[PDB]
Scaffold this active site. Structure first.
Site, PDB file in Angstrom:
ATOM      1  N   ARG E 356      -2.493  -2.646  -0.129  1.00 48.21           N
ATOM      2  CA  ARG E 356      -3.104  -2.115   1.189  1.00 48.21           C
ATOM      3  C   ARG E 356      -4.769  -2.048   0.899  1.00 48.21           C
ATOM      4  O   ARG E 356      -5.468  -1.933   1.889  1.00 48.21           O
ATOM      5  CB  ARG E 356      -2.504  -0.914   1.485  1.00 48.21           C
TER       6      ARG E 356
HETATM    7  N1  ADP Z   1      -1.793  -6.687  12.281  1.00 49.48           N
HETATM    8  C1  ADP Z   1      -1.560  -6.593  10.910  1.00 49.48           C
HETATM    9  N2  ADP Z   1      -2.111  -7.727  10.317  1.00 49.48           N
HETATM   10  C2  ADP Z   1      -1.728  -7.813   8.966  1.00 49.48           C
HETATM   11  N3  ADP Z   1      -0.764  -7.040   8.186  1.00 49.48           N
HETATM   12  C3  ADP Z   1      -0.358  -5.911   8.905  1.00 49.48           C
HETATM   13  C4  ADP Z   1      -0.802  -5.668  10.003  1.00 49.48           C
HETATM   14  N4  ADP Z   1      -0.112  -4.501  10.644  1.00 49.48           N
HETATM   15  C5  ADP Z   1       0.507  -4.112   9.422  1.00 49.48           C
HETATM   16  N5  ADP Z   1       0.212  -4.653   8.572  1.00 49.48           N
HETATM   17  C6  ADP Z   1       0.935  -4.597   7.114  1.00 49.48           C
HETATM   18  O1  ADP Z   1       1.471  -3.458   7.153  1.00 49.48           O
HETATM   19  C7  ADP Z   1       1.382  -2.427   5.812  1.00 49.48           C
HETATM   20  C8  ADP Z   1       1.328  -0.987   6.161  1.00 49.48           C
HETATM   21  O2  ADP Z   1       1.098  -0.719   7.406  1.00 49.48           O
HETATM   22  P1  ADP Z   1       0.655   1.093   7.764  1.00 49.48           P
HETATM   23  O3  ADP Z   1       0.638   0.870   9.299  1.00 49.48           O
HETATM   24  O4  ADP Z   1      -0.237   1.216   6.923  1.00 49.48           O
HETATM   25  O5  ADP Z   1       2.153   1.606   7.396  1.00 49.48           O
HETATM   26  P2  ADP Z   1       3.050   2.396   8.272  1.00 49.48           P
HETATM   27  O6  ADP Z   1       3.422   1.656   9.719  1.00 49.48           O
HETATM   28  O7  ADP Z   1       4.351   2.898   7.610  1.00 49.48           O
HETATM   29  O8  ADP Z   1       2.226   3.662   8.986  1.00 49.48           O
HETATM   30  C9  ADP Z   1      -0.037  -2.973   5.589  1.00 49.48           C
HETATM   31  O9  ADP Z   1      -0.343  -3.200   4.203  1.00 49.48           O
HETATM   32  C10 ADP Z   1      -0.164  -4.596   6.137  1.00 49.48           C
HETATM   33  O10 ADP Z   1      -0.323  -5.378   4.974  1.00 49.48           O
END
Ligand code: ADP
Ligand code: ADP
Ligand code: ADP
Ligand code: MG
Ligand code: MG
Lengths: 369, 164, 488, 31, 524
Positions: E356
């Site tokens: 991340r």
């Molecule tokens: N629009 C996007 N483009 C690329 N990767 C994404 C996108 N949305 C989410 N991700 C991937 O999902 C991972 C975690 O998303 P996050 O929103 O932080 O976790 P959660 O959905 O559990 O809250 C990120 O490390 C990322 O690689």
């Protein structure tokens, strides 16, 4: 010295195999064996092992035999410590139960010593620094999935594929190549299957009546209550620990079946009043296997090398009972029926097999390649 | 002038007290222990502080009381440059890379010296002669005496038979 | 407040749950209590009464850790509920569950403090203002459009794009917004809280020297269950001040609302309540009830709450999300299989829904196009089961053309986010509502049948699709000319 | 066949957890 | 531990849990404190206080000498939270969660119960942490203070990749200033005892024990120690963090910690939920992993990097304990079972894996090469009779390069990746990439035959590592000098060394070629 040796108590409560005992001069320690001295209406004796303490004067136990005809306030006396089992070369050739009484009607055992069933697993300093190959003298095993010294080994195979034949050959081949003895933990086994092993070993002369024997049998069969079937795996392991530590030797152990250990503990754990974890097993499932399987290891003094049978219930490999066991195992031996029926014996399907020591560091470079 | 960290809190620019601690050095691993203690007391290393550390790396004998395996004053030195350039965001001045050139000629690692005079010529104005001839002397010293490089690598033909 | 400094002693300590004996009767329910006794503590201890056991004893929950707490320790009442500061003096500052400033920037200017446990508005206070909040995101704006004043929920399992979508909405909507904002960091990552605080300071939505337009209230994973439970309400009290008193349109950001329910599930166990389905508290629906009902558009002002909802074990039938779904206006559902296939954001449009997806609120052209996307995707999921069994060639002539369009619809629903430039390695795309409707309309007609499939993957509107299709045509022309160079 | 068998096996285990939590949550109400 | 006052007698025991009756007077022990039970006149047995009932009774979690505990024994109190030995003197030793040192064959204390750094206390992760794997350090780069999960099935290389990450630090730590040294803390929760011994020997042989301390709670030891083992691991790391130094923490594994905590919770009649775990099993791992962080310039700028391992059953990420830890950590390193058996080791599934905070964590040199590799492997995976593009050729060589047993040094990794990027291994076949890479690192063909004439850049000079980290490969200082080294290596390898493959069509030579190429997979 031995304190609390013949300390008297009385039976407080009897609910199945689980029995409470009141002691006047305080309760003994945990895992302490207790003989029920009262009465001669029973045909077999009764021996209780303390699992829990309720108060300073009362202690909850589990029965190794049936709890029939047991009155309240019946006289109970301590043994001195844990359940004690005979060890040494006098055990070889004889059959035993969970407690260590001879169940083969061939006179009294020569026992020069007795050891406790609940031993502690070796410390970090006792462990071997040389992962070493245990040469079984068998081509498929030694080449493709070599068994290591100290190793937990797993024998996967359906009914009538060559399991009992391979265990018997390993008992021979340990004794040819390393001169080692063998121990067979009949953990929750069929009593009738125990006869066929005893006869076939007598015919092949791994066990000998008149002469030299190279096998020990410790059986805790389906007819016995859960307390025995739970503890009987450790009884056999204590005998193998003597040949490992004291006599300083490479030894084999044969646990058929290690699932029946976990399942036997699942029965007692229910009767003890503990809340079940996933899929109705005891909450101490990983801990029960932990203290058992960790004792089976290659020390500096010797090496126990346990081959085990593992029942996968409902063909569900994700089930806790096998899944927890998989972490402990070194060499997975898989026997296939189609390989047996085609003519290849032993019926080892080498692609589904694997070993941890199949590695250029442990075995030689020429072996691996 | 006044200064602030990434959040915007006040930061201790009083460097001079921590500089004199680095001068009483003895062994160069103690300089790092001081550099820790400044950051702990909200006082980030100054451009002069890094040069004062670089001096101690050159002068003193080894890391500490006992010798460590694969010491390398150059590797400890070049790590400190990486810290000030990328992370802390500070361009090392002309004094910084001159301390590096001294250690190449002192220890005898001339091959590094060839790379770092190229750096000193391109990046921070120039490399003033003194050490260039001392570095070139060590280059000719290796040629005339025996050979340059290990020598175990050069002679070994191998070709199919190579030990692993 | 007559019970103001009424003294009591700690009767029993079992985890975060603590019983307190009062000599002159127990205080009311939800009453905050300071533990005056000294101990070897670094930080203070404050207990909130949840239950009464008898006339003289009352069961509580600890907001800080219960370490070093002896029996019979002196405890004193505050005078009412846990009180939290409100108004424009809160803007720019970070807070904890209690309302103490945790950002080391002097004392807060607070002209007033309000209790955390307010009562929800009555039926007469409710009001509906049905206007579309254009998020600049294709899947949302087209299929499940977020409304002004709406309570919005982002349902998804671990690591699917909840925190990414909240950050994109803060970029897309919360920047150009004349109201203030509140961020309830309910039981989430402490490290994610820093990155929000810094990125807002860089963009100057929070300003140290000048005007600020954000409030931060954090009760993160490191904190015990009592704080993580109550921290959602602390933020909601501040937003309620801007709604009711100041009379204003406000945004609320609860990441994550599952952590409220989960925090209550810990205390409810220790309180000695019998658990309901799947080990949750029996008051699960009631806990969400009193919290979520306070989050609403009154006659006085208007809260517009985006919430994140964790779906545990990717089980949408679980009580914690399932109960939440009833409360929301636009339900956004994120699927793991959609994320792992390559489509970001990972929005499964069939399980999603919005109240304002209606010909009255949005335009007729918006509704008709949006329904056709939902209809086509429903047919596509039925056809996807046939291709797995039979094969792609086994389908009919008209059904093959539906698959070609539907495959492009799934690809075109993906969008490179502006906050996720580090992840995608491409610049963001704010897609306009007029662009979103027109581009999808033409795709359904079959005007872009000759356009290749991978042109639609990870782009904004139709101009970026045709731009990528031009780049694909040019690069395919060059590689073909390389293999055409050699002859004989 | 792989993925349906896994769902059968997940349902087997999840069933027995849920069975026993309900059964033993009964006798917590009964003491 | 330090005794103070005799608080009560032991009433009941139930395996590893107990309850006490208070002594006359009712002194009453403090919550979450250690208490010593007198098992004999000479010996004690530690335990932690979990329940303080209205009756006066006190719930205890037993830790040491559980067999020796009995009902009616005296119980002394400490009146303090659990503190343990921490510092530089604890390094190179094996220790319990309680702090007692374990013997092996032939220091101011710190609170285990501690709050994590708040919002203004932390800062963005900028300092890189090299695992020593080309697959990981390019695609899934770990920063100092990051929490990077390791997930996958049994025997997929979860421990090895974590242990080799600790071993990778020794080559840097020896050369660098000790201020920036990565001190490691391997926590072994619920593992087999011999596995800890083999890791001890493996750490000792690579000089890792100097910069490492081993937390150990084996399968024989009780659930109370297993529960508390990762907490004791972080405590030892936080010493280095709070005193402006960088640290690493491996928990192997959190799956077995959860099972130990479930045992404790179920035995004390705590209401179970999903998969029989208690309500707060999420909170267990959350407060652990949040204590791992990257502090601000205002508090030293130190770090504790976390590598939690979590075992999955048959590649099922939907399990409760696995899904919890994924939602806490900053992405994961997924280890696929099919890739392991297929050949690729470490078996890193790049599509499933993610970091991340990858870009900001990487080195300036590593960021240059790695940005392109994402574009090549994306097109290679999509495009994967035959028909070979430039991406298809170069993409396949990267996959061959990612296979490695022991960790690669930063210089030896980045140069072999830079060669494949600009297309120096295009004419070289896929099976001979490891033989090409071996001859690049250890040997050198330019200095061998004749056609050398490079003024500074060679592979035998390991000290260039830190110059590359500063200036990068794509730079006017090193670009022309590097492209000579690779041009000499390719032309001579293709002419002299790869010519043998057209030859060699006999039994004692094809086998000799194999045994050579097999050994080349191990050494990078
Ligand atoms: N629009 C996007 N483009 C690329 N990767 C994404 C996108 N949305 C989410 N991700 C991937 O999902 C991972 C975690 O998303 P996050 O929103 O932080 O976790 P959660 O959905 O559990 O809250 C990120 O490390 C990322 O690689
Ligand atoms: N090594 C062998 N050589 C010849 N026959 C074998 C061998 N191993 C097994 N068999 C045959 O397979 C049959 C079943 O094997 P056995 O091990 O007795 O099964 P089980 O373990 O179920 O009792 C035997 O009757 C025997 O004839
Ligand atoms: N990169 C690698 N290359 C070759 N073998 C490896 C590698 N990583 C692990 N192994 C081997 O695979 C086996 C399992 O690795 P391990 O890390 O113990 O997996 P787990 O942690 O899942 O049990 C070990 O025998 C180990 O030597
Ligand atoms: Mg999130
Ligand atoms: Mg492992």
């Amino acid at each position: 010295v031995a304190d609390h040796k013949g300390r008297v108590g009385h039976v407080s409560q009897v609910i199945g195999a689980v029995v409470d005992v009141h002691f006047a001069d305080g309760v003994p320690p945990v895992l302490t064996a207790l003989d029920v001295v009262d009465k001669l209406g029973r045909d077999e004796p009764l021996t209780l092992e303390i699992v829990q303490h309720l108060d300073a004067h009362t202690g909850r136990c589990i029965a190794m035999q049936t709890t029939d005809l047991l009155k309240l306030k019946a006289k109970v006396v301590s043994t001195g410590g844990n359940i004690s089992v005979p060890v040494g070369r006098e055990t070889l050739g004889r059959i035993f139960n969970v407690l260590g009484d001879a169940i083969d009607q061939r006179g009294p055992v020569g026992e020069k010593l007795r050891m406790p069933i609940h031993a502690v697993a070796p410390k970090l300093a006792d462990q071997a620094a040389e992962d070493a190959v245990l040469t079984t003298g068998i081509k498929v095993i030694d080449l493709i999935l070599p068994y290591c010294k100290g190793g937990k080994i797993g024998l996967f195979g359906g009914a009538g594929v060559g399991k009992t034949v391979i265990i018997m050959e390993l008992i021979n081949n340990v004794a040819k190549g390393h001169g080692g003895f063998s121990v067979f933990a009949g953990v929750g086994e069929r009593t009738r299957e125990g006869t066929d092993l005893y006869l076939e070993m007598m015919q092949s002369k791994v066990i000998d009546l008149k002469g030299e024997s190279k096998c020990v049998l410790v059986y805790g069969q389906m007819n016995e209550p859960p307390g025995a079937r739970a503890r009987v795996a450790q009884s056999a392991l204590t005998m193998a620990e003597y040949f490992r530590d004291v006599e300083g030797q490479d030894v084999l152990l044969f646990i058929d079946n290690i699932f029946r250990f976990t399942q036997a503990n699942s029965e007692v754990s229910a009767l003890l009043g503990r809340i079940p974890a996933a899929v109705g097993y005891q909450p101490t499932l990983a801990e029960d296997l932990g203290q058992l399987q960790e004792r089976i290891t290659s020390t500096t003094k010797g090496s126990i090398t346990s081959v085990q049978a593992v029942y996968v219930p409902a063909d569900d490999i994700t089930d806790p009972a096998p899944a927890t066991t998989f972490s402990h195992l070194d060499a997975t031996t898989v026997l296939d029926r189609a390989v047996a029926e085609s003519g290849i014996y032993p019926a080892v399907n080498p692609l589904e097999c694997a070993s941890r020591i199949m590695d250029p560091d442990v075995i030689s470079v020429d072996h691996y390649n | 002038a006044k200064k602030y960290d990434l959040f915007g809190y006040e930061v201790d620019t009083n460097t001079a007290p921590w500089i004199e601690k680095i001068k009483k050095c003895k062994y160069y691993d103690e300089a790092g222990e001081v550099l820790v203690n400044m950051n702990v007391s909200n006082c980030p290393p100054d451009i002069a502080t890094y040069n004062a550390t670089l001096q101690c790396i050159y002068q003193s004998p080894s890391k500490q009381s006992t010798p460590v395996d694969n010491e390398s004053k150059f590797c400890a030195m070049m790590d400190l440059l990486e810290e000030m350039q990328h992370r802390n965001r500070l361009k090392p001045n002309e004094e910084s890379w001159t301390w590096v050139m001294k250690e190449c000629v002192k220890s005898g690692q001339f091959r590094l010296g060839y790379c770092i005079q190229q750096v000193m010529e391109t990046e921070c104005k120039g490399c003033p002669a003194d050490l260039v001839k001392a570095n070139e002397a060590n280059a000719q010293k290796a040629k005339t005496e025996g050979k340059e490089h290990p020598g175990h690598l050069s002679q070994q033909a191998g070709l199919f038979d190579v030990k692993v | 407040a007559d019970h103001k400094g009424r003294v009591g002693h700690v009767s029993q300590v079992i985890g975060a749950v603590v019983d307190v004996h009062f000599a002159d009767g127990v205080p009311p329910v939800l009453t905050a209590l300071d533990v005056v006794d000294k101990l070897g503590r670094d930080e203070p201890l404050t207990l909130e009464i949840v239950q009464h056991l008898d006339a003289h004893t009352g069961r509580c929950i600890a907001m800080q850790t219960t370490d070093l707490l002896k029996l019979k320790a002196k405890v004193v009442s505050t005078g009412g509920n846990i009180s939290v500061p409100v108004g424009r003096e809160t803007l720019g500052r970070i807070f904890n569950v209690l309302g103490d400033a945790i950002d080391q920037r002097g004392p807060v200017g607070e002209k007033l403090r309000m209790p955390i446990h307010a009562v929800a508005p009555k039926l007469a206070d409710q009001a509906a203002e049905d206007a579309v909040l254009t998020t600049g995101i294709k899947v949302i704006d087209l299929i499940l459009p977020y409304c002004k004043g709406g309570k919005i929920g982002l349902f998804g399992g671990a690591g699917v794009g909840k925190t990414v979508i909240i950050m994109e909405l803060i970029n897309n909507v919360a920047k150009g917004h004349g109201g203030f904002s509140v961020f309830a960091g309910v039981g989430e990552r402490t490290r994610e809280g820093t990155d929000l605080y810094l990125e807002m300071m860089q963009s100057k939505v929070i300003d140290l020297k000048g005007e600020s337009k954000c409030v931060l209230v954090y009760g993160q994973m490191n904190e015990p269950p009592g704080a993580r439970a109550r921290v959602a309400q602390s933020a909601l009290t501040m937003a309620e001040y801007f709604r009711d008193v100041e009379g204003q349109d406000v945004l609320l950001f609860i990441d994550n609302i599952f952590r409220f329910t989960q925090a209550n599930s810990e205390v409810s166990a220790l309180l000695g309540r019998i658990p309901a389905a799947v080990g949750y508290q029996p008051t699960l629906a009631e806990d969400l009830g009193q919290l979520q009902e306070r989050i609403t558009s009154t006659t006085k002002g208007s809260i517009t709450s985006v919430q994140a909802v964790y779906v545990p074990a990717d089980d949408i039938t679980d009580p914690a999300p399932a109960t939440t779904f009833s409360h929301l206006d636009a339900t956004t559902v994120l699927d793991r299989a959609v994320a792992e296939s390559g489509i970001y954001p990972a929005v499964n449009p069939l399980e999603c829904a919005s109240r304002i997806m209606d010909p009255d609120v949005i335009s007729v052209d918006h509704y008709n196009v949006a329904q056709d996307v939902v209809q086509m995707l429903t047919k596509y999921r039925e056809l996807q089961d046939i291709i797995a069994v039979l094969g792609i060639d086994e389908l009919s002539e008209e059904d093959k053309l539906i698959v070609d369009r539907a495959r492009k619809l799934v690809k075109f629903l993906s969008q490179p986010f502006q906050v996720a430039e580090v992840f995608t390695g491409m610049t963001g795309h704010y897609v306009q509502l007029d662009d979103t409707i027109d581009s999808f309309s033409g795709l359904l007609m079959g005007t872009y049948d000759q356009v290749p499939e991978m042109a639609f993957y990870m782009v904004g509107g139709i101009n970026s699709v045709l731009e990528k299709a031009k780049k694909m045509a040019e690069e395919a022309a060059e590689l073909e000319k390389m293999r055409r160079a050699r002859v004989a | 066949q792989q993925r349906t068998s896994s769902l059968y096996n997940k349902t087997r285990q999840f069933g027995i957890t849920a069975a026993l939590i309900e059964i033993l949550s009964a006798m917590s109400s009964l003491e | 531990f330090k005794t103070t006052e005799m608080i009560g007698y032991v009433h009941s025991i139930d395996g590893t849990i107990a309850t006490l009756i208070p002594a006359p007077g009712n002194p009453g022990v403090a919550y979450n404190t250690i208490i010593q039970i007198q098992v004999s006149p000479t010996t004690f047995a530690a335990g932690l206080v979990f329940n303080l009932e209205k009756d006066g009774r006190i719930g205890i979690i037993l830790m040491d000498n559980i067999t020796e505990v009995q009902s009616g024994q005296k119980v002394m109190a400490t009146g303090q939270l659990l503190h343990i030995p921490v510092g530089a003197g604890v390094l190179g030793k094996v220790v319990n969660p309680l702090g007692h040192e374990v013997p092996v064959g032939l220091s101011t204390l710190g609170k285990v119960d501690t709050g994590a750094p708040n919002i203004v206390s932390r800062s963005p992760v900028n300092y890189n942490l090299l695992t020593g794997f080309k697959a990981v350090d390019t695609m899934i780069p770990i920063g100092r203070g990051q929490r990077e999960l390791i997930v996958g099935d049994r025997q997929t290389g979860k421990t090895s990749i974590a242990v080799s990450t600790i071993i990778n630090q020794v080559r840097i730590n020896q050369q660098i200033l000790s201020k920036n040294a990565v001190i490691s803390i391997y926590v072994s929760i619920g593992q087999r005892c011999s596995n800890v011994a083999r890791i001890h020997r493996l750490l000792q042989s690579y000089g890792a024990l100097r910069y490492t301390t081993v937390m150990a709670a084996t399968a024989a030891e009780p659930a109370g120690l297993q529960y508390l083992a990762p907490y004791a691991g972080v405590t030892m790391g936080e010493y280095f963090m709070n005193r402006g130094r960088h640290c690493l923490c491996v928990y192997d594994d959190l799956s077995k910690q959860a099972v130990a905590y479930r045992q404790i919770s179920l035995l004390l009649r705590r209401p179970p939920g999903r998969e029989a775990y208690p309500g707060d099993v999420f909170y267990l791992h959350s407060r652990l992993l949040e204590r791992a962080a990257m502090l601000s310039p205002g508090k030293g700028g130190g770090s504790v990097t976390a590598l939690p391992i979590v075992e999955t059953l048959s590649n099922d990420v939907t399990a409760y304990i696995v899904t919890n830890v994924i939602s806490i950590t900053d992405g994961q390193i997924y280890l696929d079972t099919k890739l392991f058996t297929g050949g690729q080791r470490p078996a890193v599934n790049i599509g499933l894996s993610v970091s991340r905070v990858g870009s900001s964590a990487q080195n300036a040199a590593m960021k240059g090469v790695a940005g392109k590799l994402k574009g090549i492997l994306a097109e290679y995976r999509k495009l994967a009779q035959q028909v070979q593009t430039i991406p298809m050729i170069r993409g396949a060589r990267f996959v061959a390069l990612f296979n490695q047993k022991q960790p690669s040094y930063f210089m030896n990794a980045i140069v072999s990746l830079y060669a494949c990027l600009n297309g120096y291994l295009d004419d070289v076949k896929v099976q001979y990439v490891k033989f090409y890479e071996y001859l690049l690192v250890h040997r050198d063909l330019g200095i061998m035959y004749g056609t050398a004439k490079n003024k500074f850049f060679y592979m035998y000079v390991q000290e260039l590592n830190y110059l590359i980290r500063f200036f990068t490969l794509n730079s006017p200082i090193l670009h022309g000098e590097l492209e000579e080294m690779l041009k000499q290596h390719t032309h001579l390898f293709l002419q002299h060394y790869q010519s043998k493959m057209n030859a060699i069509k006999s039994e004692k030579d094809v086998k000799a070629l194999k045994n050579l190429l097999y050994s080349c997979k191990r050494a990078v």
